[PDB]
RNA sequence: CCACAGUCACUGGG
RNA sequence: CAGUCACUGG
RNA sequence: CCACAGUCACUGGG
RNA sequence: CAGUCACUGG
């Protein structure tokens, strides 16, 4: 294998798609960015370690810009304004096969896939209800 | 409308889906789990709070569960060999408009598609390389 | 480039291949793992530091499982009955040059080689006689 | 029957092969060395020793010189420049059968075959990367 | 892709070139050396850290050796007759785009061009004037 | 000779060229600037100085502006987002020869020849990978 | 941070 | 030196 | 806040 | 843990 390479982190279509592409290693942290100035880019980054004797913990960032009135290549402050932040950590029982993860990652996805609660809420600017 | 409705966690293929649904609200925490005892459930918790002055997080956890038989004192149980734990965070600013939150969903459902890198590596057992 | 990349840890022919992956690079300690269940995973490490004004010092570590299932109150985990720890040191002076090391290598080669003493006896269960 | 006899250390085609050669077994410890001078010797020792009531544990050690000519006073003698050294360990639980060993060792040998990570990096004054 | 490549840091011609290739990158600083004893090699580092919370840091290292061949204890050993330290620290600031950063290279790489003020004080043992 | 003149900072290829030139002299410290308000200009320092009784050590500093939605003439805040700060330091033996001199000075180019790995994770915003 | 020093991913001084 | 071994104990 | 830990809307550590 | 390493020191 060797899964370090780019991919499509927004998928537009084919027309307007973010790409995100490797741009460190260090430390055994995988990090992607998309083609930008590091202020307004998408970052990804992706860690493994063995949190305990039981466990295995994926930590799992990501950045995305707020692209509503931005100017590109400009300097926007304060960050705090441009910027959504997404922390996932993943625990894994040392147990688990990896058809096991297989699932695992399912349940990720379907938690995250078009129409379901989850993703409806947060594109709507809303909670539950 | 309202949100809060029930969803496939997990697609097979609409044999031996695991679907998860509304089941408590209480103290403003959304939670859902699958037709299963407590000791054995899929469960899947979302919250929203105004972080700071100028932030919104979301707060999302789903657990997935190694379903097991135990024989405690003779007597058989349904019961959970180990859980999986996911745990994630979304800071959005304020000031992120309704597309601004849309490209963070579509963002999300990219880092795990499958083929990706992430999704790769977790299903395998193994890091980034 | 890089070599920190999978390899063929133990080579079973072409099929019980036992091959070990990029896992974690923390803290200068390069770390393999093979697929599936972590509790039954094969694990190599490595790391090289300058242990003196005049040495350099590798550090490789190697851990070989027993598979095996065990069971408790008729729940079934995929652990490892047993694991053979394998712990070498190799100390190479700065004034080595790459055919030094070559050579080193090829030492460290022939000492394992089948048919030789070392290797005999550890098959056997033997020391030497 | 003796596994206590000289071999080829160093495979360095058909000509210049180093070959060490039985030299004592005091102690329970066996050790080759390779022809003429001492000083500018080649040294293999290998002993094994139940380290606990569970497992066996095989001790190797590994010399390689960097012969030299020193000279002092206008005499000259055969020396080392500098020598590197190999320490490894061993450790197998009594529950090992025939067939466990020879996996270690093939692992053991699969860790050091030409190409893989370990041993290019080291011949090449070099750590992961 | 990957960036950590081998280049060469001095161009003879062809004749007489130093290359230098990847030899590490534990602890997030990359490494290259060229094909010598790690006592008498060129040797590049770098690193990034994202310094403040709107700055990020390059750390780039070089070392040119002069190298000689010195008698210790009768013995000849290969050695550095003594070291040129290059030692350069870029701070960006995470508003600057590509193009940006293109113009900071160009502005290093015109800096020392054969011709210019500073390279040509450099080689002549002088200063500005 | 009479090294202290203008020189290309920028090679843009004939059109669009950044010019540096003397600007000042204070404390032997040689001084260029591009043609714009002290804000916005391309400034370049260099000093040598004897810093020990084995070494003297060459100053060099460069300063780049952001020029991505800049504004010609215009007020810029804050000044840490529109500038990039490059500090090189250079420690010669005094041992070091003309020739000597020369060799390092290669080495200085060669470290940032386009299609590099340095310059070429620095134009992209990105580390080593 | 330093036109601070060194034997330089380390050490020492402002 | 010992251990289910980048950690612990002598 | 933490590529902090867990048995994880709870507990413990920086 | 370190060392010209079945030995020594932490």
Redesign the interface.
């Known amino acids: ?5 780019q ?6 279509g084919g027309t307007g798609d ?1 790409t995100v592409a ?7 942290v ?4 998309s ?5 307004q ?2 970052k ?1 980054t ?5 949190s305990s004797a ?1 466990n ?1 913990k ?1 930590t ?1 960032k ?1 950045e ?1 810009p ?3 009135t931005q ?7 304060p ?20 058809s ?15 129409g ?14």
Chains 1, 2, 3, 4, 5, 6 share one sequence.
Do not use: H
């Open positions: 294998a060797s899964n370090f390479t991919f499509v982190l927004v998928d537009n973010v490797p741009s460190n290693f260090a430390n055994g995988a990090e992607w960015i083609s930008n100035s590091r202020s880019a998408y990804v992706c860690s493994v370690r063995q039981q295995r994926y799992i990501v995305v707020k692209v509503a100017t590109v290549g400009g300097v926007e402050l960050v705090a304004a441009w910027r959504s932040y997404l922390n996932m950590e993943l625990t894994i029982p040392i147990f688990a096969t990896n096991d993860c297989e699932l695992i990652v399912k349940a990720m996805q379907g938690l995250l896939k078009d379901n609660p989850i993703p409806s809420a947060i594109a709507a600017n809303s909670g539950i209800y």
